[PDB]
Design a protein around this ligand. Structure first.
Ligand SMILES: Cc1cc2nc3c(=O)[nH]c(=O)nc-3n(C[C@H](O)[C@H](O)[C@H](O)COP(=O)(O)OP(=O)(O)OC[C@H]3O[C@@H](n4cnc5c(N)ncnc54)[C@H](O)[C@@H]3O)c2cc1C
Ligand SMILES: Cc1cc2nc3c(=O)[nH]c(=O)nc-3n(C[C@H](O)[C@H](O)[C@H](O)COP(=O)(O)OP(=O)(O)OC[C@H]3O[C@@H](n4cnc5c(N)ncnc54)[C@H](O)[C@@H]3O)c2cc1C
Ligand SMILES: Cc1cc2nc3c(=O)[nH]c(=O)nc-3n(C[C@H](O)[C@H](O)[C@H](O)COP(=O)(O)OP(=O)(O)OC[C@H]3O[C@@H](n4cnc5c(N)ncnc54)[C@H](O)[C@@H]3O)c2cc1C
Ligand SMILES: Cc1cc2nc3c(=O)[nH]c(=O)nc-3n(C[C@H](O)[C@H](O)[C@H](O)COP(=O)(O)OP(=O)(O)OC[C@H]3O[C@@H](n4cnc5c(N)ncnc54)[C@H](O)[C@@H]3O)c2cc1C
Ligand SMILES: Cc1cc2nc3c(=O)[nH]c(=O)nc-3n(C[C@H](O)[C@H](O)[C@H](O)COP(=O)(O)OP(=O)(O)OC[C@H]3O[C@@H](n4cnc5c(N)ncnc54)[C@H](O)[C@@H]3O)c2cc1C
Ligand SMILES: Cc1cc2nc3c(=O)[nH]c(=O)nc-3n(C[C@H](O)[C@H](O)[C@H](O)COP(=O)(O)OP(=O)(O)OC[C@H]3O[C@@H](n4cnc5c(N)ncnc54)[C@H](O)[C@@H]3O)c2cc1C
Ligand SMILES: Cc1cc2nc3c(=O)[nH]c(=O)nc-3n(C[C@H](O)[C@H](O)[C@H](O)COP(=O)(O)OP(=O)(O)OC[C@H]3O[C@@H](n4cnc5c(N)ncnc54)[C@H](O)[C@@H]3O)c2cc1C
Ligand SMILES: Cc1cc2nc3c(=O)[nH]c(=O)nc-3n(C[C@H](O)[C@H](O)[C@H](O)COP(=O)(O)OP(=O)(O)OC[C@H]3O[C@@H](n4cnc5c(N)ncnc54)[C@H](O)[C@@H]3O)c2cc1C
Ligand SMILES: Cc1cc2nc3c(=O)[nH]c(=O)nc-3n(C[C@H](O)[C@H](O)[C@H](O)COP(=O)(O)OP(=O)(O)OC[C@H]3O[C@@H](n4cnc5c(N)ncnc54)[C@H](O)[C@@H]3O)c2cc1C
Ligand SMILES: Cc1cc2nc3c(=O)[nH]c(=O)nc-3n(C[C@H](O)[C@H](O)[C@H](O)COP(=O)(O)OP(=O)(O)OC[C@H]3O[C@@H](n4cnc5c(N)ncnc54)[C@H](O)[C@@H]3O)c2cc1C
Ligand SMILES: Cc1cc2nc3c(=O)[nH]c(=O)nc-3n(C[C@H](O)[C@H](O)[C@H](O)COP(=O)(O)OP(=O)(O)OC[C@H]3O[C@@H](n4cnc5c(N)ncnc54)[C@H](O)[C@@H]3O)c2cc1C
Ligand SMILES: Cc1cc2nc3c(=O)[nH]c(=O)nc-3n(C[C@H](O)[C@H](O)[C@H](O)COP(=O)(O)OP(=O)(O)OC[C@H]3O[C@@H](n4cnc5c(N)ncnc54)[C@H](O)[C@@H]3O)c2cc1C
Ligand SMILES: [K+]
Ligand SMILES: [K+]
Ligand SMILES: [K+]
Ligand SMILES: [K+]
Lengths: 67, 67, 67, 66, 67, 68, 67, 68, 66, 66, 68, 67
């Protein structure tokens, strides 16, 4: 039947988790078609003078392949 | 001693992670008593024209059983 | 063929590990029939003035579903 | 929407798909809005002729009424 | 020495597990050369009116990279 | 009380998953006694010109050991 | 070369996940130097009349050791 | 240097966890040499009319192999 | 509130509970506000009479002073 | 910034580091802004003289162009 | 079809990781046949006055079993 | 009986894996007594102009606690 592919991306944001996820999805849309779902694999980040410097959300993005 | 039960629910929200968690907990309260804690097992979601379509947070909800 | 169900319970006891497991199984028997096996998922607990206060054993209890 | 996941173990002497079908058929007896499943484990018992009973442990997700 | 690459695909089929796996490998062959092995990561699916609707097998496909 | 042992085998077959599992169990039967249960640890395989070449199912086979 | 140490902390907040993470990082800065990165290990929490009572984020905080 | 081997056994006992572990170690001693350490992999069991029927502790037993 | 988790390995020739008690007793010597523990691993050494030393690896959580 | 992670398996008859270097060298052929790697698995093949080929499965992270 | 078996061994060496892996494979060769692949499960070791004393690599060794 | 403690360190080195492990153990010895064993949790690193820049080995170091 249909076949999907999953790519692993890492979105980042200085503001929050949702923002980091949205950033990765927005970049994905630039070159990928038929984006369907995502799975968060890891949540990490860097530390700076303001506490969190960058939130880094590692996720798998699943999209349908064309035939 | 006391015995607790853990049920697995999936809360969803178009707005964010916390909202999805709160949605699952609110639904849990409708039929379950003595809700005590929760554990997030997975964070995933669907993708749409606005990026994230639905955030889906899979969690275990622990509550005390009556004797 | 036959179908079984697994429920997740957390047995607790101030006596010890075995007692915590037994507490969960005793409560399970109150509303579940055809209890067959259990699987320990986690062993944890609270700390008191002189050591372990309450042992908490998270387990899955498997039982056969009726007709 | 809020979904719930229950854990069932389907069994069958025939094969993996049959074991999964057995669990879903029983789920349907009392659960509405069945949507997806996830296989957690595949195991089974052994007899003189090899596999006696195939056992598929799965999580079944369904939408809760609101 | 040689270097291989692994891509993550989700093969789907309404026929069964093997068919889902075969669907993923058939699509992989369309754009990937020197396909060598696969590893199943997850088996899941959707539910229909009378049982499994679509089987979905998440797998990693390993292939040798060219010069 | 009783003690069981678990051996890890990889059954293979060009036919399918069930056939691969059965191949491992058939082999275990040649030199082991009291085979009771199995647990699938991994499912993988090789690829050929027609898709799956060989299905490979990694499993643990549990059997009862004879009493002292 | 350089050597880092990782400590496990649990930040809490009644308001959200990011707030809980920031709380742990702020406490870490009180006694630790050279804070560099963090990794979320678990997200859980307590339940109250308002739904979530306390969000609890378990994280590893990595920092460089001095020589 | 030295090489060790690990075997997987499931000790059982109606008495408790420690007893189940001891049962597996006692059995390992019958045919193995240089038993050094063990690691509990899983704790499970069967259920009877009075709660736990049989405790089952799955463990890996590590032992030293004789030098070449 | 902010908590910290440390990893200790309690040991005892007696049993699992005794091993856990040993780790908690040592934790109490230098750590305040001990609240909970989580068993990470259960292992041990072997002697001529079976278990020599039971070893319980656990994480101990305690509240940090503010 | 947004990064991407690809999974490669480097191999070498020499050792672990050489296997890792092999994967990174191939990655560099088509991927820009290579930043970090994570070893997922270490395995290999066996021959008459022991290890034939060391195989290191790793994830390679790189920054995507914006 | 064909069936393989996997044994778990811990190779050790004061020299390094590769040497530890090689030690386990050399030992496996003494009593096993058709050794085909290995998988590292864990890397650990002991500590001495000069840092690492003994490297210990836990691995699974897969080999083909003879046909029925 | 005896009680041991495990600390998590990340040894780094531009020389190789063993060197990274040795760096962590050398630093550990500076403030920890009765060092006994170590367990590798992760192997990772940074990438430079011609390959691995810095190897980073995350490990747990176990040592015996004193009276
Ligand atoms: C392994 C697996 C895991 C899954 N996990 C989840 C989960 O966690 N939650 C969940 O709710 N569902 C999940 N799904 C279901 C998934 O999100 C889809 O609903 C399902 O796979 C059906 O997809 P499709 O065939 O319609 O693909 P689609 O890609 O939806 O099919 C064509 C559609 O693509 C749209 N499209 C075209 N260009 C683009 C573009 N550039 N970007 C985006 N869309 C575009 C078109 O408008 C068209 O309607 C999962 C599926 C699989 C296989
Ligand atoms: C395996 C396990 C994991 C845990 N993990 C955590 C954790 O991550 N974080 C943490 O802080 N604690 C955790 N706990 C502790 C837990 O949250 C409780 O504080 C503890 O178990 C004591 O619960 P209880 O017996 O007071 O139950 P309770 O259910 O609190 O006992 C009775 C109480 O129920 C209340 N109640 C009645 N009806 C309802 C209702 N409909 N909804 C809600 N409450 C109602 C009553 O007002 C009454 O005070 C965990 C406990 C276990 C066993
Ligand atoms: C995924 C899976 C994992 C398993 N893991 C293990 C394991 O770790 N260890 C192990 O040893 N086995 C394990 N088993 C086997 C299991 O424990 C059973 O032996 C097996 O599933 C067969 O169960 P059954 O059909 O006989 O069920 P049963 O529940 O034994 O069938 C009905 C029985 O229930 C009794 N019963 C029900 N309610 C009552 C009551 N109120 N009062 C008195 N009697 C009552 C009846 O008298 C009757 O004999 C596992 C099975 C599966 C499917
Ligand atoms: C955590 C999570 C993981 C997911 N994983 C996957 C995945 O792996 N693959 C994938 O493809 N999708 C996956 N999904 C998506 C899922 O399959 C659904 O498509 C999605 O959740 C939307 O469901 P719904 O609200 O339409 O529910 P539905 O349950 O579809 O809504 C009501 C439907 O129930 C039917 N119904 C109720 N009772 C009966 C009955 N007795 N007999 C027949 N029909 C009946 C009605 O006819 C009606 O159409 C996932 C979703 C979540 C939240
Ligand atoms: C990390 C890892 C894990 C592995 N896991 C397994 C496992 O689970 N099971 C197992 O059995 N093996 C496994 N292997 C082994 C693997 O399957 C290969 O046998 C091994 O890597 C050697 O591959 P190769 O260099 O011969 O590649 P190949 O891809 O076999 O080399 C080139 C071949 O590709 C053919 N080819 C390419 N494109 C086409 C085309 N379009 N039409 C026709 N022919 C074409 C050529 O004719 C040529 O013979 C694994 C290997 C690694 C590195
Ligand atoms: C850790 C653990 C996990 C388990 N998981 C499961 C599970 O997933 N599912 C489940 O249903 N049960 C499971 N069990 C239960 C198991 O399958 C047994 O039913 C139970 O342990 C009782 O075994 P026994 O003492 O009767 O052993 P045995 O005496 O070995 O039982 C009789 C068995 O011996 C075999 N046998 C007899 N003679 C021979 C011979 N000459 N050659 C080869 N075989 C022979 C028979 O075919 C039969 O299966 C589990 C048990 C344990 C301890
Ligand atoms: C195992 C591992 C995992 C990693 N994971 C990630 C990741 O997920 N994401 C990522 O982006 N990077 C990650 N890194 C990289 C990490 O964040 C650093 O960028 C890198 O390790 C270099 O650190 P450093 O030597 O400069 O240390 P630094 O501590 O940055 O070196 C000295 C610096 O400390 C500053 N400093 C002094 N006092 C304090 C204080 N009290 N609090 C804070 N800073 C102070 C000084 O101003 C000075 O510039 C990881 C590194 C390792 C080893
Ligand atoms: C991967 C790994 C993990 C480890 N994990 C742990 C751990 O969790 N905890 C820990 O404390 N140590 C652990 N160890 C250390 C281990 O227990 C040994 O102390 C160490 O490996 C040194 O062993 P050895 O070379 O002295 O072996 P051996 O020569 O096997 O040591 C002497 C042992 O032989 C036994 N023995 C002698 N004759 C016989 C006989 N005739 N029949 C049966 N047994 C006999 C003795 O009872 C004694 O235990 C681990 C080692 C490795 C490699
Ligand atoms: C990530 C996480 C996981 C959790 N998991 C669980 C779980 O599995 N089970 C569960 O039941 N709960 C669990 N909890 C809840 C936990 O046990 C506490 O109930 C909760 O964190 C609230 O702690 P507190 O702020 O009251 O701290 P406390 O430390 O209880 O506050 C101060 C207390 O310290 C005592 N104290 C300080 N020094 C000493 C001393 N030397 N001797 C004696 N007493 C002393 C004081 O008497 C005082 O009562 C968890 C919490 C978190 C954050
Ligand atoms: C999820 C995650 C995990 C991480 N884990 C770790 C970790 O384990 N350890 C750690 O230390 N850090 C880790 N990091 C941090 C990482 O290594 C980077 O330091 C960080 O992501 C910042 O990268 P950058 O934006 O500067 O990208 P860069 O790619 O460094 O930015 C552009 C650079 O690319 C170079 N470049 C491009 N093409 C070529 C070419 N062909 N040849 C040579 N140079 C070229 C340019 O010269 C330029 O300097 C992690 C980061 C994330 C997001
Ligand atoms: C679950 C699984 C995982 C795998 N993972 C990998 C992987 O990670 N990487 C990879 O490259 N391949 C992997 N393989 C492939 C594997 O290494 C084999 O290439 C493949 O299974 C084919 O084996 P065979 O049937 O030729 O066996 P065999 O007949 O065993 O193959 C010949 C082998 O026998 C050995 N041999 C012959 N005579 C002797 C003797 N007298 N003493 C000792 N040894 C002798 C040779 O040295 C040679 O290696 C995997 C296979 C499976 C089933
Ligand atoms: C959970 C667990 C896991 C284990 N895993 C392994 C494993 O993977 N491999 C393995 O082989 N073993 C393993 N072990 C065994 C471990 O390495 C020890 O051999 C065992 O715990 C016994 O330790 P001990 O009590 O002798 O401690 P020790 O620390 O050996 O006791 C005190 C010793 O420290 C020395 N010392 C302290 N500071 C200094 C100093 N500054 N200068 C000189 N000497 C100093 C003293 O001279 C004295 O001999 C494990 C043990 C446990 C509990
Ligand atoms: K958030
Ligand atoms: K099948
Ligand atoms: K006990
Ligand atoms: K090395």
């Amino acid at each position: 039947g249909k076949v999907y592919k999953k790519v692993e991306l890492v979105g980042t944001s200085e503001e929050g988790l949702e923002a980091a996820i949205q950033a990765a999805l927005a970049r994905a849309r630039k070159t990928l078609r038929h984006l369907d779902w995502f799975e968060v694999k890891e949540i990490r980040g860097t530390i700076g003078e303001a506490g969190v410097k960058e939130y880094q959300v590692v996720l798998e993005v699943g999209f349908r392949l064309e035939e």
